[PDB]
Symmetry: D2
Subunit: 29 residues, 4 copies
């Protein structure tokens, strides 16, 4: 379970990064 | 055409935030039992 | 409870694949004009 | 423009990675 939970938190944190990137791209366009 | 793409990006990053919230919920549940 | 979480992960999977397809579409459009 | 495209390709790349990871996790929980 700890590996699953740590992987979901990794994916979480990358999804947040992806949302920030798409926000940045939207503003440039 | 550009306004359509900007609005689609806003939609996707909204859905992306929702997905992340759903995964955080799942992570919480999986740690309890 | 576990079956519910597995089914939700399959929903999220599907939605993430759809999102990627949408972004690939956007990437195509933005390179044309 | 090339910067934007290359970032979108990085992102959807990583999205495919995320989907494979979630598919792996679903299988593990199926136990």
């Amino acid at each position: 379970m700890k590996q699953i939970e740590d992987k979901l938190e990794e994916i979480l944190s990358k999804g947040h990064h992806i949302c920030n990137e798409l926000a940045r791209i939207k503003k440039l366009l």
